[PDB]
Amino acid sequence: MLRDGNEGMSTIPGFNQIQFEGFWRFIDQGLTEELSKFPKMEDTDQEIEFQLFVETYQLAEPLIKEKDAVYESLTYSSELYVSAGLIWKTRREMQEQTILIGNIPLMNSLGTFIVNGIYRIVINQI
Amino acid sequence: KRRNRFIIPFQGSQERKKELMSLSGISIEIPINGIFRKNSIFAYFDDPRYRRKSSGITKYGTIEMHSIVKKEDLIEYRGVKEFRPKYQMKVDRFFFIPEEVHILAGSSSIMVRNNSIIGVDTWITLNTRSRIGGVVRVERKKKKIELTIFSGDIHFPGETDKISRHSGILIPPSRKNSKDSKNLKKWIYVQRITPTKKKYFVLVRPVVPYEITDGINLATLFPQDLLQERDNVQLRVVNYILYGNGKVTRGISDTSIQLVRTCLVLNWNQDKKGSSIEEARGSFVEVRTNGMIQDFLKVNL
Amino acid sequence: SVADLLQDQFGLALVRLENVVRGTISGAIRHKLIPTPQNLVTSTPLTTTFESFFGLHPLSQVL
């Protein structure tokens, strides 16, 4: 994806596009390209099977707020929900439901993450 | 997707138009999302050859019984007493003799006493009638009572009968210098019933034969791959027996009790120190052309 | 940048998660229980992985 292309070519670009664009690119593509790498792991008894449907993932609105995240030394984050069932090779069944894989931190307007009530930033590397 | 089972009806040919026998659709264990897999409980079909709605006791002929199956720990499922194939034996033949059973209420009106010889159309209750003639015996249970009567001719040994020794056993037809026995062309079950503490009767009951054919296992149901990939799915056909030897089946109202049901088993054959085959994922793949379509289960590991 | 670091951290978290599900499925048969898929996945790997990343990695620094 691309925003207005003439940014940095007609005005001084905002001193945030590095972190902001990196996080947006991560959310847009890295989640998909990492969930696909999740295997189809199972048991050696030919009795159970686990599957993770890839093109179903979505995030949830954070429960706490950033002010409360820094107010109670919490971690501002959003829950990641992926829809995928479990297959049992005992009655040949597949129970399909949406599960909560975990929590992923989110950036604020400053380009930082609130982890344990602490503002943290990620430094680029060469 | 209400239940994890699908019935695939097999169409009947135009060669049978006098018997309205129900076509037992192949029952398969299907997932909720219709995506099943191999190496699991495959489809099963309830054969109508050995299905009877009359209570009967079946006994198998003496043979080599070497149980090649260790005890499996019972896994309770909501206290549901489903039908489990506990007797997977290669039985060549068996004999099942029918019987008449009535499970009347404990407080219900009973007109026939225990160990009483009654003919047909004997009203044991207000709205319960009979179907055969025999010596019906009644036993009182915790919450009900049971009346049992198997169709059999009654006899008493009189100074010349050699059938006293054989009790509750089925003997095949014998023709060896039988100068007094006639019309004994079928096996008969002799039971020594204790009518009294000093008088006992012998019941000779008809027995119905039931045999099993040879099972064909599809150990080569796949083509030879050019990638040197071992096929980890092996499909075999077998028979599942509801009751073991010398077991009596209990039949409910308007319920057909099945003796043998066809079953399909999916197994694996994995090499040593090459690849620990765990399981595989399957689905349904379709391809149509020339007004014909291909339907098979596509299973990739 | 943040994209690649977060992608690598997510990959490590997913590896830890699949190890956890492998252990659970090893323990989901010997206990004879039919669990819902959520019972096979707990949010231990992702959360702890990200906390360790933001607490120990030298490329994540306090603002």
Swiss-Prot record, chain B:
A GO term from the CC aspect: DNA-directed RNA polymerase complex
Assigned keywords, A-Z: Chloroplast, DNA-directed RNA polymerase, Metal-binding, Nucleotidyltransferase, Plastid, Transcription, Transferase, Zinc
BP-aspect Gene Ontology terms: DNA-templated transcription
Localization per Swiss-Prot or TrEMBL: Plastid, Chloroplast
Top-rank taxon: Eukaryota
GO terms, molecular function: DNA binding; DNA-directed RNA polymerase activity; zinc ion binding
Location, primary (coarse class): plastid
Family per similarity comment: Belongs to the RNA polymerase beta' chain family. RpoC2 subfamily.
Function: DNA-dependent RNA polymerase catalyzes the transcription of DNA into RNA using the four ribonucleoside triphosphates as substrates.
Quaternary state and interactors: In plastids the minimal PEP RNA polymerase catalytic core is composed of four subunits: alpha, beta, beta', and beta''. When a (nuclear-encoded) sigma factor is associated with the core the holoenzyme is formed, which can initiate transcription.
Protein name, as recorded: DNA-directed RNA polymerase subunit beta''
Organism field: Spinacia oleracea (Spinach)
Residue range from the parent sequence: 566 to 866 of 1361
From Swiss-Prot, chain C:
Subcellular compartments: Plastid, Chloroplast
Residues spanning the signal sequence: none
Record text on subunit structure and interactions: In plastids the minimal PEP RNA polymerase catalytic core is composed of four subunits: alpha, beta, beta', and beta''. When a (nuclear-encoded) sigma factor is associated with the core the holoenzyme is formed, which can initiate transcription.
Similarity remark: Belongs to the RNA polymerase beta chain family.
Functional summary from the UniProt entry: DNA-dependent RNA polymerase catalyzes the transcription of DNA into RNA using the four ribonucleoside triphosphates as substrates.
The protein's name: DNA-directed RNA polymerase subunit beta
